[PDB]
Structure formats: C-alpha cells, structure tokens
Symmetry: D2
Subunit: 494 residues, 4 copies
C-alpha cells in the first residue's frame, strides 16, 4: 500500500552531469522549474546549450573507445550494474515519486505505484538482456567462415518529454546501456529533476564515467545540438510529431545518424455491439483520461456501434463526473493539473473548436480553480471525422465519442490518419478480434483492454506515430549495429 | 483437375538403395507387397535385414566424412538439390499418386491432391531453410571470442509407417538433408514402393551417393538393426507407441543415439454449446474418418456439451452414412480399405468391445464386401471414459461421441490419457479459445477447425504421443548438433 | 562455358511499368540511353517524373490493401513466385547479361558469370525466407495473451544506381516482396534497360498487378518525387552519400517514412608483415579495380606494413599493367569504360589532384582511346591521409598505397573517415584477426580475402556509409513493421 | 580476496524436502555422510527411496497444475525469485563453501571463488531468461492464425553427481525454474549437504511449495525411482556413461519421458608445434588436474606434435611436482583427496594398468598419507591409443601424454572414441584454429585455452558424452515443450 508523500523537499542535483561529475552551464545561465499545481518555483537548474552538449558528447565518445572499461567489461556485468541501479531506485522510491509528483503535476499514488514500479521493472527487464544480445554464424557460399557481431551503435543522443519524465528516462538508458552504448540524455525543460537525481544513482551504482551524461535545457538549443551533432551516432526521441520531423531532417543534414522516434497519436478505440459494456466503458475511460489525458496512447477517438451508442455515451459521461481536482500530493485528489500554460491553452482552444464545430458538449468544457493549470474532465459526443478534436492530438482530459454502423467503414475511419501509435478493440467475437486487429494500422492493438504496456513487449508507432520499436526483444536490436566478419579458410564443412 | 489414374502399373524399383545403386538383399530373400483393396500381389521387394542395414550405415557414414562432397557443399546448394527433387516429384506426380493409391488402399483423388501436394510443399519448405540454419556469437565472460556451429547430427536412421508412406518419407528426409545429415530410411513393410521410386529421383536430382539409403524390410529385423546400431547417431520414428518404447530402450542400451518419436494418439475434440454446429460437425467428422480413420491425429474422442449432444449425434450419424465403399482407384468411391488383415481384425475387435461394454451403436459396425479389408463407417454414442473404444487408438473408421456438462470436467477428461498428440476446440468465445487451448496437454490444438497440418508449423506430441517436433523452425534445430567454440584473445570489446 | 554475347540487340521494354502494363510518360518526354564503350545511343526510354511516380504509388497502395490478392496470398506462394522469377532470369540469362554489358560498360563474362549468377542466387535466397518471417508470443506481465505480427511495412520506394543495375534491382525487390511489401523502383537514368526487361518477367511469373512498379527517369525529378511522397511508407536508396542526405531530409520533411541507405565508401585494406603476400596482392588488387573501380566496397586505401611496403608496391604496379582496354563485349578485353562523362571527369580530376598534392604516380594516370570513357589503370604510392585521393571516393581504376608502422596507428587511420562500408585485414595471426576486426568501424570486415559478398550475409555501412542492413536474416526484418497485439484473458498460465 | 573457512560446522538440514517442508524418510532409515580428507562422519541424512520419490513427484505435479501459483505467476516474477535466491547464496557464501569443501574434498579457496561464484552467476543468467522465453507466430498456408507457446515441460526429475555438488544442483534447477517447470532433485549420496541447505533458501526466497523437491539417497533406489516414474515428464542426468544408459532405457520402458544426459569424457587436447608453449603447458595441466582430476572435461589425452614433444613432457612433469597434499581447508594445501574409496581404487587400478601396459611413469603413481583418499599427481608419457589409460575415464590426477606427426592422423585419433564432451587446440595458425575445431567431434572446442565454462554458452556432449545442451540460449529451449495453436479465421492477411 502507499506511503505519505514527502513535503519539505530539498533539492540537491540541479547541474549538468558529465563524466560522473556535476558542471555549471558553460554560459552560467540557469532556468527555473515550477510545480504546475501551485505555479511555485521548485528550484533553478543549470541551462545546457550547444557547448554543454559538446562536452557531453566528448565524454560519451571517450567512454566508448575500444579498450575502455565500458567496452571491455563483461556483458553480464553491464546486467549486474543495471540491476544495482534498480535497487537504488527501490531505496529512493518515496523521494523519486514525490519529486515526480511535484514537478510533473502527477497524482502521487500513481507516481508511486505505476511510474516507479514501471521504472524498476523496465530496468530489471533490460538487465537480463545484456549478455543475451548475440550475433550469428552463417553458412555462406564458398570456403569462408562468416559470423556477425551485434555491436553497440555507439554514442546515443536521447531526447525525452515531460509526461512520464523518469519512466521515459529509463526506457531510453536501460536498453542503450544493456547493449553497451554510451548516451547523452536531454530531459524536457519542464521536468529535469528526477533525471538529475538519477545521475547521482548512476554514479553510486558504479557505471564508468562518460557512460551516462545528462544535459538539462531547452529544445531548439540543447535538443537541436544533439540532433545536428557530427559525432552522435544515433538519436532517439519521444515527443511531438512536429519536433520529430525536425530531428529526422537534422539527422540527414548532418551525419546521417540513425534515428528512432515515438511521436504521439490519435488512437482509435472501437466498441462493437457484442462487447462486454462494463469492461469497455472503464478501459476506454482510463484509456483517454489517465494522467490528465497526457498519454501518447490516449484513446482519443472512441467509435461505438450505433445500437449501443447512446447508452455508451450516458455511462461515459457519468464516469467522467467522478473526479476531485486539486494538488496531486493531497489525499482524495483524483485529477491533477496539466503540465504548463502552453498545453493548458492548447487544450482550451481545442475544446472551444469542438463547441464551435458542432460537437455535443456532455460535461466539463472549461477551466477550474484559480491557481495551477486545471481543466474540468470533458466529454464530447456526436463527433465527426472532419472536426479538429477528431484529428489533432489534444493531450488533455477530453474524450471524443463517435458512432459507426459498418465494420468496413469503421476500420477505414480508424486508419484514416497520419498517426498510428495504438488502437483498442472491444468484442466477444473471435474472428473480429483477429481480423480487425490485423487490419488496423497501429503498432499496438489491445483486445478487450487498453493501455497495457509491459517491458517484454515491443512498443511504437506505424506511420507518423514513429520509427522503430522500444523494449521487448525487438527494441534491443535497435541499439545494436551489425558487423559481418568473413574469414577465408582452406575448406569449409557443414 | 484430377487426372485419370494409371492402371497396369509396371514396377521397376524393387531393391535396396545404397550409395545411389540398387542391391539385392544379402540373404537373397524377397517379400511380397499387396494391394489391400483387392488382396492381389503387386510385386516382390528385396528383404533388407541387419546385414543390409550395416552396408547402408557404412555408406551414410562415409558420405558424412569431413571433406566429403555433401559436407563441403554450399548450404544453398543443398537447398537447390531439395527443390530439384520437388520438381521431379511434380513430373512424376500421376505415377506416384497411382502407386500410393494401389499400395496403401488410399483414395486416388486424395493421394493426388493432398498427399502429393503435401510432398511437394514439404520439400519446398525444407529447401528454403538449408542456408538459414545459423549459429550464434556469444558475449561470454572473460577475454574470449565464442561462437557456436549448428552442425548436422550425422547418420540418421529413419523408420516410418504405412498410412502416408510418401509424405512421411519426405517429412523425414527433407529436414535431415536440409541440415546436412545423411540418412538410412526404413519404409513400412506394407508400403515400400513409393519410397523406392524416390530413390531413382534422388539419384537423378544429383545427391551424392550415400546421402540417402533406403532399406525395405520388416520391423524387428531391419527396423531393430537401425535402433541398435552402434554407428547411427540419431533415430527418428513414426509409428505405434509400443514400438516407440522399444526404439527408445534400444537407443539407451546401444550407443545413446538421439531419439525423436511421433506415436499416435487419442485426440479429443471438444464442442461447446456456443459453437457453429455445421462447421463443427463436418470438421469433427473428417477429423476422425479421413483415410479410413488411419490418421495419427484422429478426433477419436468427441466431447459434445449436453444441451447440443443429441442434435450433434443425429447430424454425425447422418453424415457417416454418405459413403460409397470400394476400390480407391474407381471414380465415385469415397472410402477405401484398411491397410492389412492385422489392422482389420484389431478394428473389428474394438468395435465388438464397444457393443459389449454398452456403447450405443448408431450405424455401421461390421465388415463389407467379399475381397479386401473394408469396414463400414461406424458411429458409437453414449461412450464413457472407461471403455476400450474411449482409451485405445482404433485406427479405423470408428467415431466415439461423449457428453459433458462442465468446462473443468471436460478439460480433465480430455487430458486423462497417456496420449497427447492433438486436440480440437469448437467455440465462439475468445476466452475459452485461448485458455482452454493453454490447458490442453496436446502438441497441436485446433480452434474451430481440425486436421490443419502445414510445413511451417512444428508438429508432434506431448506425453506418450512423442518426443521432439517435426517441421517448422523448431523441427529443424532437432536435426542439428550444437558445437561451442571458445577462442582466447588478448582483449574483448563489445 | 560462357556463351558468345548477342549483338544487334533489339529493344522492346522502353516504357514505365505500372499495374503490370506499360505506359508512356505523362509528359510524353523520352530520354536517350547510351553504350559507354562506344558513345552510341542504344534506345530512348519514357521519362518518368512526379506525375508518373504518383500513378505508380497509387498502384502500389491499392495492391497492398487488406483483402487484396498480394495481402491474402500464402507466404509460401510469395516464395514460389520469387523462384519462378529466378527461373525466368536463368532462361533469359544471355539476353540480360548482354544487355547489361552494353548499357553498363561492363565486361561481358563478368556480367554473365558474376552479376547474373548473383541475381539468381539472391532471388533463391529471398524466396526461401518468405514463409519463415515469424513473429513472437510473449510472456508479458498480467492476465493477457500477447503476440506480435511481422507485417510488411507497405509501399516501398526503391532508388538504385548504375554500377550493378540488375543485381541492385533484385537486392531491392527480392527481400521487399519476400516480406509482402509492394514497391516503386527508380532505376538509374544511365541504366534502365535490364530493369525494364525485368518488368516483363515479373508479369510473366504471375505477380499481381501493382506489386512491382518501375519508373525510369532522373534523380531530382522521379527520385525526389519518391523520397517526398506522402503515401510512400519507406524509401530504400543505394547511391552517393550526397544524395543519401537529401533522401533522409526529404523523408523527415514529408511523412517520416522509414529510411534505409547504402552509400559508398573509402574502405581500408590493411596488410600486416606476417601475411601471405601473393594472396594479399591479388585480393587487394581485385578489391580496388573490379568493374573499372566502380564498386562501393573498393579497397581504396591500401595500408601496408613498412617492412613489406616496397615489395607490395612493386608487385601491385606489375599487376596493374596486365590489362587490355576496349569494348567489354569483345573477347580478350579485360577492362571496359567508366559509365559516363561526369564520372570520367571526376576521376581525371582526382588523378590530377594526386599528382599535384605529391603522391607518386607508379603507372597509368590518363585517358585512353578515342571513343568511350576509358581511363588507364592507375597506381599511386606514398599516399598520405590528407590527400584528396586518400579521402574522397574516386569510383575509378585508381589504387592508393600507404605505409604504416604501428598497429594502433593504422587502426586509428583506418577509422578516421566519415565512411564505414567495409574493410580488409591480411594476417596469419589469430589474435590480430579477431581483435583488429572488432576494432574496425566498418560493416563488413574481410580476413585474408576481400569482396566476398553473399546473400546469406547482412550487408551495409557504419557511419555515413549507410543506415540499415540488406540481405541475410537481418535485412529481412527491416522490410517488416512490428505489431503487438494484447488480448485480455481471464487467467494466464505459463 | 578469501575469508577463513568456518570450522565448527553444525548441520541443520538433513531431511527430505517436499512442499517446502522437511520430512523423515518413509522407512526411517538414514545414511552417513563423510569428509573424504579425514574419513570422519559429518552427519546422517534421511535415506530417500521410491516411496519418498513418489511423495515428491506428487508435490511437483500439484504445483504444476493449471491455475496454481507457479503456473499463473508472471514470468518476470520467476526471474525476480531466481535473483533473490542468488542474493541468499551471496549471504551464505562462506557457509556454503565451507560445507562444500568439507563434504566434497574440495580446495576451499576454489570452492569459495570458483564454485560459489559460478553458482551465483548461473542463477543471475537464468533469472534473466525467464520472461524472454517466447514462442512464434507463423505465416502458415490457408486462412488460419497460428502461434506457438513455449510451455514448460512439467515435472522434471534431476539426478546429479558429487564433483561439483552445488554448482550442478543450480545448473539443473536454474534453467528448469526459469522456464516454469517443477522439479525433483536427487543429489549424489556422497554429497547431499549443500543441496539440502539450498532447500532452506528456496523456501526463504519465496518459491511456492512443490516447485523444488529434494530427495537424498542412493542411485538404484531414489535415482531409479525417478527414471522409471510414470508421472515424471522429463529426466535430466549428469553422471557416468554406464548409469546414463540405464536412465535412457528406464525412460523408454516406462512413460517415454524426455531425456537429457551429460556423461563425462576422454577429451583430447592437441598442441601443434606452432603454439605458444608456456600458455599451452599451463592450460593443459589445469585442464587435467583441476579438482583432483574430477572434471568431466578433463584434458585426459594430450597430443603433442613430435618436434616439441620431449620438451612438453619435461615441462608438464615439472609442473606436476608443485603440489602440497592435505586437508583442503588448510592454508597452503594445493591438492585435496579423491571423493571416496570406490574412486580411489578405480584410479590406482588404472595407474597400475598404465605401468603394466608399458606407459612411461614420469612422476607420482601411488597413494599418499595415511588418512583420506589421496593420490600423488601422476604423469604418464609415451601413451598409445590401445592402453586403458588412453581409453577409459580415470577421474583422478593422472595425465596422459601422446605424440603425433600428422594433422589428419591426430584428428582421427582425437575422434576415435565413443566419448565427445570437449576438446582443446593450441596453435597460432588461423586456418588450423577454424578447420580443426570444425572437424573435432566434441561439444565444446577451446582454442588456445581450456576449461572455460560460462553461463552464456551451451554445454554438452557429442556421441556418448551426452544428449542435449545445458545453459546458454540453447539449453533453455530444452526445458520447454512446444505447443502449436491454429485458429480458423475468415480471411488471413500478411
Ligand atoms: N509522444 C509523446 O509522448 C509526447 C510527449 C510530449 C508532447 N507530445 C505532443 O507534443 C505537444 C507539445 O509538447 P512539447 O513539450 O512542446 O513537445 P516537444 O516535442 O517539443 O518536446 C519533446 C522534447 O523535445 C525537445 N525539443 C523541443 N524542440 C526541439 C528541437 N527543435 N530539437 C530538438 N529537441 C527539441 C523538448 O525540449 C523536449 O525535451 C504536446 O501537446 C503533445 O501533442 C507528445
Ligand atoms: C492512457 C491509459 C491509462 C493507463 C494507465 C497507464 O499505465 N498508462 C497510460 C499511458 C499514459 C501510459 C501508461 C503507462 C506507461 O507505462 C506508459 C509508457 C509509455 C507511454 C504511455 C504510458
Ligand atoms: Mg514543442
Ligand atoms: Mg507392429
Ligand atoms: Mg548525382
Ligand atoms: Mg555409479
């Protein structure tokens, strides 16, 4: 069960982390970090920019040199180190979860049970792959012995968002380290604090200097320095589709670095008339409203078959009114604030567009309170595909409900988007479960559930929701570069 | 199009096949081979025994020596040779299918469409794996470079039954050759003829001598010579459970040769009340009656939920009366004879036990015609678990129908047998499909179908229905012997 | 046997290939295609541009729709169709090899033995993977059944160069088709002719319309239409590093399409004093001069240990003087022309830079003949790392020889380039073979050989020599898009 | 560095372990356990027999039932439990290592550094595979969705020897538990004590009752009860070739249970004239004399090329005289006793046969001391292939040195044995390293080293040295049973 959050949080790790030391920014500038529930400043953090990135990339390159400790270390030992890191996150779990709740506007019990539990499980999963990343021996033509090495890619720039700050930090470093790479991470400017605490734990677990470097700062400065850097071998980014395009173009213009992207979505959740309604209502509701709707996988287009549509709407509206808004550290609060003013305004503007374009406002639809970025949970019905709320990622607590009559029609409508991160299907019919899931152009498809993410599974997007997969067996091979070695011999035998 | 069968077949390949030559038996003895529909002798074949097997094993060992053509040949070339073999089977498809129909008591159209098509597809599948059987490179502890080789096992003895003589011959040689082994095949005494034709095609395709050797003859003579042989590395057997036990014990007493077994069954087919009855009735019917019930996977315990049981019985009985018995080469005939007198009598005896022990005879139940081993298609209802017909593999056209009320009860009853080759489930419920299939102790579980066998799928038994898998990715690695090579180096890098 | 080439080739396939039909260009324009040995026009070809590409992408999308013949076809059948295609290439092997020799300036005997043999082997390899591309089932946390599908990516745009026109066409289509994709291929403007013949064979083998579409034309027109296209899921490119950058940036600006690139090189070949000199001299010589030096993998920096350097130079110079230049269809000719005027001039310019910057001209160094783009085989010694000939890809018959004393120095010098496609090591020492190959930042490393490329091996570049691998097991999974399907169940069992 | 051993060892776990409780033997009998260095009784242990085995198998079957805690537990959690077990072995390392040294006649510092370190590393390796054992989804022919489950095999009987009692216990349970099986382990009657202490740790780590059951006792009683048991799904055995034959025959006669065997060896170590002699002398020496020669992989035929043979002999004899015999807990002692009187006598008898058959005794050759089973380290030269010491596994500190002149001759001689566990090659030549290792019929082949065993590598024997592999990726799939599930659907798409 869940301890009381800390309150009197004193901050200690506020600097740039390079070669297991803490540096001031080269410019000397700092930037403030705020609690979105109260709008109060938590602390100031060193403002990393291009010159700080260059120092970090240099440290990461040195630590990846042939003969260095990280390169010559047993793979089994990289595994041990990743597990020791997980142990230290268990020790510091109350601190981290408190810190994440304060900085990210996140409900404490969720930060403590879901995010932190996830952080630990991800690292344990990663630790186990370290010495199980293998190459091949290949029966090629002619008198040769041929094998492949699954080498690390090298220096990996890793740029991450503010919605699950610590979990996303570990989704990046875990697999990269497991495969033997070195990294330069750029936490979101809104949420650098848990990442910086992780720096102290990295050094304490015993990772060689240079293996993890962490540069807080802004996007078009520190972020763009990473994507354009001539000595970064690979960039991995989770964020907005818009910035993902800039990353890919920067990668092409500079040194053709490898790119993986996870870009958000407009995921459809399809409820057929033969489905278990109770189960479907709850999963679809959580699917869209979790963490104030700030999930990449939000079930933000809910298609419900005509014969059950009015009932589904009624039950969804009723479910959406059971929230207590407030400070996410306060017991009884069940909905926190949006992350910052930019997102707050983006959401209100999209809610306004829904009213304007004729969607039916069923509940909520405006701000709440007079401190922090709170929006009432909002449901819209009679949404049609041409509306802004049906096409654009809102990233706030706003559900769209739409009706359909035909199986073929709803598949087409589900697929009619540049997005493809995830999808949900609710049905009792075997054939529909298998065939509809095959037809949906989405990287994860849930049947009779939603938002089920686990470290064993590959995760990522079709189309403009992403390139590559993370986690699972398939994610790990993304953090390797394959080398083929072919050795002439006098005579080959099978 | 199914062509007209040949008649008046002249036989040519009647000898023992060793080093791509045809040999008389060492003893000089021959044995007769019959058409079971007519009881007429087709021809005589050289009778292989221990001394013939020894010659065949010597050939197979020589052809497997380091530096030999078959060991030094490109893996891709083993692939090409398997495909060329498939091309020759297409060329000779009418001859082979006729020959199989005559020698095996098999319906011609099925021999031509299913068996021969199967033969060609199996070989094409196998051909493609040849140069895709790969080892690993392994990030082991310490300053070493380590790799594995997936070598062939070596000389493989392969003993096969009379129900699908040609298909089973290719299920054995295809994967063994693909992986680079040499073999000594022992066709069933009832059905040596298509196998011996295959000898001519093997030579004609261009396989080096010694790579396939074929020894017709009896079980406790030629068959047991193989299982006890001190220079056979591996035995693979398809047949009766009883003989499978002898194979395994002979393997232990002699040289600890590797063993794989496929041993027949008493497969349950479970029909829940929520199933599509039309689909279920036909699949369950074919599932038990195909090839005069002479299928290892026969759906020989049909469990039907209480509420639909009487209707299921009525429809199954009605379906079982639509057969025309006779010579399987004659158009219009839809049921041929049992393979020989021993099986004929085994079946009549088991039918008699069903009457005696109180099962309800719904139709058939006795012999037919005045030449050849024909048995009327027989259905028994109100079968209970203690009866001989519910426990023993009958291997004839005899269906058992049983009722159940409880989900847990039927899973337990399904699993309550030493057999475990296959099982069928018929339901419209997603949860039942997944969970019941997980709970059944059977190697292949079909959902809303039955008897669907394909070269891409691993196939074989739980419990006393087998050891190992055949075909698919998994089958192939069981025709390899893994070697680990570990090389000291001055310094390892990831 | 190498047959006599054809002469007086009559051309038939000169159009744009879409939905298994031949189309005029939308503009009506045509462009000429030349024989580079004679400078004579061979024929004119329809000039594809953006509007043609759009038609081709529409066809490829339609053929990829759920329920279409190519999507519902058995994977094994995609395999059979690829093999049938290989059979037709064998039938048409003299025509194709002649055609390639005429259009590409390629030595006929090499076109007939190496390129065409390669073409056939690549397709056979690909055919075999089709029904062996598999997903996973995953023991994820919680009460779920989870599996992955290895789906095709979808519509793949494929842009290819003029050095191995037919081989590169099949390296692209073979794996894409094996995995179930549809494609739009853009042959190099210099060399469209064998590709267009392949169109006729594709139709004749029985591929559904829309599965391969082929658009001849120029780069910044047709090529750039492909890379910017909003409905192309993936672009695959082989060519110059410069254009590769444009492809990657276009992919980012447009629809974030997946990208794979193979970009040429400046591959080092390192000869240690303990090496077999005879073997090393010949491999290094072929390694740089093959196909008039127009190989991506050309061994264009030859590092030779100080103690054997002068002898290595002497023997290399002697080897480089044994060529007869002329028309590559004429018996006895052992060196054909460069592909076109642009390359011709690029090479002469780089040769001139070598003289200017102080390298020692050992032989050749200027043009030959009075028609067609012939350059004398040229060797430079005392080359140092700062020279243009040591840094830039020359793509002509020009060898650079350089000396080294230290193991560490030469590894560093080898790696000091933005390129990383391949490398060669020549030594008798086990430790050097393993450790030096691990240290070289190159995608393929040869030990005591060079230029050994086979369909079973993954192939591609480190750093700015590429992204992704082609062929082998690894190449195939890069023509798949992974989908995770997670189904809620009542209770999971292991 | 190495703590002082404990001395005053009080024993606590002396009983049979079933369902996480301690039971008296059903008969009430106990058997004594001795310290081989002193011949003193350490304690008495409950004597398990057939009826105790039956209780253990019943517990293991119950704990493997569908819906049981072990079956429904997350795979990731099986991993956590295996790591927690490793942590408890780290806590109890001094106790365990002391206990192993006392009971097994093992040098304490080796028990503490090598065996215990190995125990821990094995478990960590296993723990990581738990949630990475995956099945497949398969693009089979026709309108079906097909997947496989890698299920556990079920109840696994595991019979182990006295040479590495704890390490062998964990080599068995680690992989079996990781894959989700339940076990019944039968420790060697000489060395039950560390295994029984492991019982307490299993219960303390939190494994459900019935998952590990441990039955001490004799071979033909408790051992044979396991191999013949009608409800054991699989037997895994490490021991004598003779008993391995009995296991395989019992498996066939009873219920056709799956069998894996690791059976000892007569491994050849080949030193070519071009090898590094210093390195070779030491590795070959350790390779045969480690743990008083009681290693399955002992380098017990040392082939040395003629030109370096006399020098190799001289240096090997000199190396063999640097031992201090005595109590293995006493500092300065570098050779302990043989395990018991039976082995002691077997070794003296084989040493006698060497003298008798004409081998040249270079040093040692008789007993030492007057308490405990000590044999002087013995070297024999001029050994020829017909001698008993060249053919039979001695399992004592006895090295055989033999000469060879020809490469082909020495490969033949190396392979001329029913054994094939391991082999060593010492050479500076690349071609020899690769080709000779390919030609040797041995499951592990070391190049320029020996006895390098790591958890990432598959381990086991060719021919009569074993069936199956342990550890590595390949070992784990041996503890799974594959199930294929095929589900009819309306229409399949790629
Ligand atoms: N998929 C998801 O989970 C989502 C998560 C969050 C928002 N998602 C979506 O994006 C919108 C805007 O949020 P923002 O916060 O602006 O995201 P950005 O994509 O900008 O922030 C992502 C990271 O990129 C760094 N960054 C910014 N500009 C950069 C540049 N030019 N070069 C390099 N880097 C740059 C930046 O500092 C941060 O660390 C949200 O409303 C969501 O729709 C989806
Ligand atoms: C959106 C539906 C709510 C489900 C709650 C949840 O665990 N979510 C919801 C959603 C925001 C999400 C998680 C968990 C993670 O591990 C995630 C990891 C990566 C991306 C999103 C994640
Ligand atoms: Mg932004
Ligand atoms: Mg019999
Ligand atoms: Mg250009
Ligand atoms: Mg014994």
């Amino acid at each position: 069960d869940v301890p009381a959050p800390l309150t009197n949080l004193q901050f200690k790790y506020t600097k740039i982390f390079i070669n297991n030391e803490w540096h001031s920014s080269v410019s000397g500038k700092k930037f403030p970090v705020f609690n979105p529930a109260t709008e109060e400043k938590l602390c100031e953090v060193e403002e990393g920019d291009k010159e700080d990135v260059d120092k970090a990339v240099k440290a990461a390159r040195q630590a990846f040199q042939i003969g260095s400790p990280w390169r010559t270390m047993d793979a089994s030992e990289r595994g041990r180190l990743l597990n020791k890191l997980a142990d230290l996150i268990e020790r510091d779990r109350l601190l981290l979860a408190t810190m994440e709740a304060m900085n990210g506007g996140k409900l404490f019990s969720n930060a403590y049970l879901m995010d932190l539990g996830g952080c630990i499980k991800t690292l344990r999963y990663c630790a186990g792959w370290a010495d199980k990343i293998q190459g091949r021996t290949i029966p090629m033509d002619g008198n040769f012995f041929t094998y492949t090495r699954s080498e690390p890619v090298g220096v990996c720039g890793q740029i991450i968002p503010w919605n699950f700050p610590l979990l996303m930090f570990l989704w990046k470093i875990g697999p990269a380290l497991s495969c033997g790479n070195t990294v330069v991470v750029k936490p979101a400017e809104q949420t650098p604090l848990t990442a910086l605490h992780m720096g102290s734990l990295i050094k304490e677990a015993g990772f060689p200097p240079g293996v993890v470097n962490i540069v807080p700062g802004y996007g078009p400065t520190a972020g763009a320095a990473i994507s354009s850097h001539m000595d970064v071998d690979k960039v991995a980014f989770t964020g907005s589709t818009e910035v993902g395009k800039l990353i890919k173009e920067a990668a092409g213009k500079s040194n053709l670095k490898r790119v993986s992207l996870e870009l958000g979505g407009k995921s459809p959740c399809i409820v057929f008339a033969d489905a278990d309604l109770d189960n479907a209502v709850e999963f679809a509701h959580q699917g869209v409203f979790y963490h104030q709707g700030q999930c990449c996988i939000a079930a933000s287009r809910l298609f419900v078959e005509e014969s059950i549509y009015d009932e589904f709407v009624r039950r969804s509206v009723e479910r959406a009114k059971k929230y207590v808004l407030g400070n996410p550290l306060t017991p009884g609060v069940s909905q926190g604030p949006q992350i910052d003013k930019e997102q707050y305004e983006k959401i209100l503007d999209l809610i306004e567009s829904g009213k304007k374009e004729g969607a039916k406002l069923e509940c909520g639809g405006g701000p709440w309170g007079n401190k922090g970025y709170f929006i009432q949970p909002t449901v819209f019905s009679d949404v049609t595909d041409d509306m802004r709320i049906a096409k654009e990622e809102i990233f706030g607590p706003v559900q769209q409900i739409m009706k359909f009559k035909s199986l073929d029609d709803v598949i087409k409508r589900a697929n009619n988007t540049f997005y493809g991160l995830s999808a949900g299907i609710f049905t009792n019919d075997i054939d529909k479960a298998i065939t509809v899931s095959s037809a949906l152009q989405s990287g994860t498809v849930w049947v009779n559930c939603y938002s089920v993410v686990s470290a064993q599974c590959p995760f990522g997007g079709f189309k403009m929701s992403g390139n590559g997969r993370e986690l699972g067996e398939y994610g790990f091979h993304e953090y390797t570069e394959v080398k083929t070695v072919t050795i002439k011999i006098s005579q080959k035998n099978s």
